From Swiss-Prot:
Family: Belongs to the protein-tyrosine phosphatase family. Non-receptor class 1 subfamily.
Sequence position, cross-link N,N-(cysteine-1,S-diyl)serine (Cys-Ser): C215-S216
Binding annotation for substrate: D181, C215, S216, A217, G218, I219, G220, R221, Q262
Protein known as: Tyrosine-protein phosphatase non-receptor type 1
Transmembrane segments: none
Domain Tyrosine-protein phosphatase, residue spans: 3-277
Annotated organism of origin: Homo sapiens
Entry-annotated residues carrying Cysteine sulfenic acid (-SOH): C215
Active-site residues annotated for this sequence: C215 (phosphocysteine intermediate)
């Protein structure tokens, strides 16, 4: 079926939970043996969210190459994303090592450091120009260059330096600051505006390594971001945009990381975002 009318048909019939459970039943299951080794317990935020072995990002380190991160490679859309968890106190250095080694231009953050009165990820970037951060385990230096605070999101320019080679690179930090503590946003308008700002920066483009995207577990909000982006790109590329099937795209992405889209409300919100974004395109 088309998307917008499939949408109203699920709303009128109130069957979002049944649609979402079908997705969960059909989703791929692949091994995640490296993630479950005992030496990696303090590298995982949640025991039930792990990268598959076949698609995990490897650190270029011979001691321990493990990080909770997955490469999502979308062949028809010609887009790649790295989806990861919010860094932990003992993985902030690994996180920036990955950004460096994978040649990423942008980092997309969809959570606040504290939500619901608890810490959802480490404070992994510097908050003042004159107070830079040094990650001694991976030999990197990170400096805040500039910061632009808007009503729904903040963009930061950062300088990452590889202290071994003295090479430097500019990283853009796109921070969506207004996702609610419970539920999903009422309108997708500010999320779509944010997606378009990331696109405009070049961070999603083939001349760079894959964008790094995260929330707390790296599957819920993060899944919504890449699912909406890929669906809109396919609607631009194809002769028949109504052939784009969001449930099929989601199942393809779930071949690369488990659990993408965590609730039936996130699924409905993803439909809403794609439906509204397609118009604005023309
Ligand atoms: N009809 C479409 S959108 C084909 N398809 C299904 N899943 C993905 Cl990804 C693609 Cl492409």
């Amino acid at each position: 079926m088309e998307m917008e009318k499939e949408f109203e048909q699920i709303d009128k019939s109130g069957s979002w939970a049944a649609i979402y459970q079908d997705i969960r039943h059909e989703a791929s299951d692949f091994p995640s043996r490296v993630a479950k080794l005992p030496k990696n317990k303090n590298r995982n935020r949640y025991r039930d969210v792990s990268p598959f072995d076949h698609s995990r990002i490897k650190l270029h380190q011979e001691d321990n190459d493990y990080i909770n991160a997955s490469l999502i490679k979308m062949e028809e859309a010609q887009r790649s994303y790295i989806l990861t968890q919010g860094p932990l106190p003992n993985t902030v250095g690994h996180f920036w090592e990955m950004v460096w080694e994978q040649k990423s231009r942008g980092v997309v953050m969809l959570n606040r450091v504290m939500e619901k009165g608890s810490l959802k990820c480490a404070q992994y970037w510097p908050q003042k120009e004159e107070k830079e951060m040094i990650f001694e385990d991976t030999n990197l230096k990170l400096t805040l260059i500039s910061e632009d605070i808007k009503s729904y999101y903040t963009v930061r320019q950062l300088e990452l330096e590889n202290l071994t080679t003295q090479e430097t690179r500019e990283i853009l930090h796109f921070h969506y600051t207004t996702w609610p503590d419970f539920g999903v946003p009422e309108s997708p308008a500010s999320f779509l505006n944010f997606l378009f700002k990331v696109r405009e920066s070049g961070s999603l483009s083939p001349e760079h390594g894959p964008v790094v995207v995260h929330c707390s577990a790296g599957i819920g909000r993060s899944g919504t971001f890449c699912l909406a982006d890929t669906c809109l790109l396919l609607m631009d590329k194809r002769k028949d945009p109504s052939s784009v099937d969001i449930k099929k795209v989601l199942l393809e992405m779930r071949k690369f990381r488990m659990g993408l889209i965590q609730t039936a409300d996130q699924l409905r919100f993803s439909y809403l975002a794609v439906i509204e974004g397609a118009k604005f395109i023309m």
